[PDB]
Design a protein around this ligand. Structure first.
Ligand SMILES: [Zn+2]
Lengths: 115, 144, 264, 217, 108
């Protein structure tokens, strides 16, 4: 359940995300009609003093039955043009994003590990 | 499913422990109706623990805690448990007594262990079949 | 004192007579119900063919609870359980004498004990030849769909796949509330159990478990005339034109014992 | 005689008829899909139809950490760490989309609930997805793993040290001092273990269920 | 809180004489055949019950003297015997309480 604050982990090879930084990440905006951000929901993340759009791929909030509950909040950065900021994703990514309404093929085309 | 009694959850059990210990010692106790009803379930379940067996180690821990006076522990396994072996339940008889005339008008009841040596309580009696209405019902029963 | 005294049915009953009284009550209930089992064999009122604008009678059912139900698509749908108990037509009101627009039929279910009920209620039911029912409700029924009083009504009146409207009193919460009649509209029926007269209805229904509810055909404009393809007056087991399956399922519903669904 | 938890009804005012109907569906489904006997702590591999994928099934392996629900709606949760990510999946026993259920390793753990494994070290929770089934002895009890897991730093999801949780599979001594236990023990509520009002007996119900289940077979 | 003017006795008289505030009569009064005294239909007679408690206190007093010490509850069954009744073989293996009074008519 991504929401105000909610320390997150940037699962991407983007230069801003890849480089370690002292400041804990305070996510700003959730790109949904509702205020809660879950897997597959676009969000705005502040990394390295910059603002970049991110896509949630995992959360620690209890989920529906028959689904894996992640132990860490995982996100993937997406450019303004719609292409992912990073060319690779390391954490296992649920395959439900394909059926989820929206544009998720590009991110799935970047996710090596599927669970 | 539980009455809100005592200054805390411990007090209710301790108060129930005090009530349970007294009833076992005397086998007939007069108390407020609400308390008697609340503790009636515990007393019946305690008899089941006695029926479970004296050798049952768990029963001793329950009996030891609930019964402050330890002389009662042999009594439960050797008096109460043998007494109720035939019975499958209803070990305790609770009846309503007129409210205390102590200016607070508390609802009073008497709870006793069945099979006790104490004099029988004045229980209510249903109407005899010799009554006119019962005799009329008897005729209907015979015809059917 | 030459004054009134308070009495109950068991006050003057002896143990031997009390046991007999229970047996007698059971015998009366059995005999009365069996007598009313066959409506069509008891001089039924004339039944008319369906025409547009006809309205069928509703039923009263008990809310058993909710359980998960699965469809052939593999999705899980929570469904609420409604049981029709001792549903019988009691009193018919003429169109003019009740409402100029339409006539109404009174239906009562969930038989109740006779010991703690007023004699007036028992007197009416004695004429009807049925044991007293917990709730009396009025349903607007057209003249063509009128059914003779005392006709048993079963869950088979409704069929799987039909949307229905359920109205029931909401759970009361005390001073803080609730305990108000409310209606839920557009609930589809997933399955009906004929043997136990259990109807499986999509969604939740107001009220607590084991709470009586009123069930009537959906009044939404889209489902204006659904009774054309359904038993128009009602389903008569007495007629036995075709014995229905014990459990009625919707086509999408995945019956238990079917092969495991594979998403191909 | 192993009676699965779901068959046992809970105390309440619910109609017994509902359980009978629910059991019939459960028993009939069990013929279609075999539900092997397993306990919390057992590693299971479950085959399930994939809705997101088209005409593809998958198998997920994890240690059974918790069992919940009753009747047809009963579910079981098995945990594993995949690519370094702890994952717990709650599988409904009678869901038609479960193609097959395999108990790769039938065993029990110290506690009936293994949610504390999240706070334990990852290795205790790590299991190979491709691990082959290990041998089992039919005329024996399921092996009970008595290994005590080591916890991560004191901040945990839940205060397992409290008497309410009463976890026996945690190496509290290593991570907790005796004084901390006493602070936790302030919530002992010793009267609770001695209260007979919280006791519910299903032994008679469990015994009766066995014949009904076998009769249906 | 006081009303802006004194409440008239007429106004006050109506309030106190409203039926809602008056004392209600009870019709559940019953007679006890056992004591011949009044009782409620849901309440047991106290005149007879008083005898039981008084006898119980006397019986309890005899038991206390026989035990002779605190925490001396027997592990064996207990029985009460009155004058004119002597311990029998069936009474063996049971604590026996002896009462100077003869067997009460009500007690059996
Ligand atoms: Zn008397």
């Amino acid at each position: 359940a991504v929401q105000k604050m909610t320390r997150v982990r940037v699962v991407d090879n983007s230069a801003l995300g890849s480089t370690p930084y002292h400041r804990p990440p305070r996510c700003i905006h959730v790109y949904n009609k509702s205020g809660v951000g879950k897997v597959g929901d676009q969000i705005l993340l502040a990394i390295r003093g910059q603002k970049k759009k991110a896509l949630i791929v995992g959360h620690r909030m209890p989920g529906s039955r028959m689904t894996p509950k992640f132990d860490s909040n995982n996100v993937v950065l997406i450019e303004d043009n719609g292409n992912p900021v990073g060319t690779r994703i390391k954490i296992p990514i649920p395959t439900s994003l394909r059926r989820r309404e929206g544009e998720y093929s590009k991110v799935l085309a970047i996710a090596q590990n599927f669970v | 499913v539980y009455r809100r009694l005592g200054l805390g959850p411990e007090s209710r059990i301790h108060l129930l422990r005090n009530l349970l210990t007294g009833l076992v010692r005397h086998e007939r106790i007069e108390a407020t109706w609400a308390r008697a009803d609340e503790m009636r379930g515990y007393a019946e379940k305690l008899i089941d623990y006695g029926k479970l067996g004296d050798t049952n180690e768990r029963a001793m821990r329950m009996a030891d805690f609930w019964l402050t006076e330890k002389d009662l522990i042999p009594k439960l396994f050797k008096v109460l448990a043998p007494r109720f072996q035939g019975q499958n339940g209803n070990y305790t008889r609770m009846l309503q007594i007129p409210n205390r005339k102590e200016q607070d008008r508390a609802k009073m009841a008497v709870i006793e262990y069945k099979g006790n040596y104490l004099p029988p309580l004045p229980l209510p009696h249903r109407d005899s079949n010799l009554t006119l209405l019962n005799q009329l019902l008897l005729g209907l029963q015979q015809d059917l | 004192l030459h004054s009134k005294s308070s009495t109950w049915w068991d006050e003057h009953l002896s143990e031997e007579n009390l046991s007999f009284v229970k047996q007698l009550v059971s015998d009366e209930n059995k005999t009365q119900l069996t007598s009313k089992l066959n409506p069509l064999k008891d001089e039924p009122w004339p039944l008319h063919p369906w025409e547009p604008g006809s309205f069928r009678v509703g039923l009263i059912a008990l809310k058993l609870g909710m359980m998960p139900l699965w469809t052939k698509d593999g999705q899980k749908h929570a469904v609420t359980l409604l049981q029709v108990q001792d549903c019988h037509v009691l009193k018919y009101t003429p169109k003019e004498d009740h409402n100029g627009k339409i006539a109404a039929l009174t239906v009562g279910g969930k038989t109740v004990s006779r010991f703690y009920k007023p004699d007036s209620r028992l007197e009416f039911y004695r004429d009807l030849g049925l044991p007293p029912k917990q709730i009396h409700k009025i349903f607007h029924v057209t003249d063509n769909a009128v059914i003779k009083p005392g006709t048993p009504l079963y869950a088979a009146h409704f069929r799987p796949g039909q949307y229905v409207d359920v109205t029931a009193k909401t759970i009361g919460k005390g001073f803080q509330m609730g305990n108000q009649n409310r209606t839920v509209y557009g609930l589809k029926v997933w399955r009906v159990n004929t043997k136990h007269n259990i109807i499986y209805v999509n969604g939740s229904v107001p009220g607590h478990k084991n709470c009586l509810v009123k069930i009537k055909d959906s009044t939404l404009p889209a489902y204006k005339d659904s009774c054309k393809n359904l038993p128009f007056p009602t389903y008569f087991p007495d007629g036995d034109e075709e014995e229905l399956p014990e459990d009625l399922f919707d086509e999408s519903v995945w019956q238990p014992s079917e092969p495991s669904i594979t998403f191909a | 005689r192993f009676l699965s938890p779901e068959f046992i009804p809970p105390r309440g005012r619910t109609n017994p008829l509902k359980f009978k109907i629910e059991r019939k569906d459960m028993l009939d489904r069990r013929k279609v899909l075999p539900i092997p006997e397993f306990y919390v702590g057992s590693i299971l591999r479950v085959t399930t139809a994939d809705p997101y994928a088209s005409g593809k099934t998958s198998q997920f392996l994890g240690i059974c950490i918790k069992r919940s629900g009753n009747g047809l709606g009963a579910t079981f949760t098995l945990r594993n760490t995949i690519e370094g990510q702890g994952v717990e999946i709650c599988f409904e026993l009678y869901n038609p989309r479960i193609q097959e259920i395999q108990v790769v390793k039938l065993e029990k753990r110290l506690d009936d609930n293994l949610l504390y494994l999240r706070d334990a070290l990852p290795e205790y929770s790590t299991f190979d997805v491709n691990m082959k089934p290990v041998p089992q002895e039919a005329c024996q009890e399921v092996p009970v793993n008595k290994l005590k897991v080591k916890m991560k730093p004191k901040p945990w999801s839940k205060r397992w040290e409290r008497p309410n949780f009463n976890i026996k599979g945690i190496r509290f001594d290593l991570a907790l001092t005796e004084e901390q236990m006493k602070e936790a023990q302030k919530w002992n509520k010793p009267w609770i273990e001695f209260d007979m009002m919280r006791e519910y007996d299903t032994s008679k119900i469990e015994a009766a269920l066995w014949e009904e289940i076998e009769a249906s077979k | 809180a006081a009303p802006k003017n004194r409440r008239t006795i007429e106004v006050n008289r109506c309030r106190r004489r409203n039926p809602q505030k008056l004392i209600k009569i009870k019709n559940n009064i019953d007679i006890c055949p056992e004591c011949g005294h009044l009782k409620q239909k849901h309440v047991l007679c106290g005149y007879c019950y008083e005898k039981v408690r008084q006898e119980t206190t006397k019986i309890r007093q005899q038991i206390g003297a026989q035990e002779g010490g605190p925490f001396r509850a027997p592990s064996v069954e207990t029985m009460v015997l009155y004058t004119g009744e002597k311990p029998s073989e069936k009474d063996q293996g049971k604590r026996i309480v002896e009462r100077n009074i003869k067997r009460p008519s009500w007690f059996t």
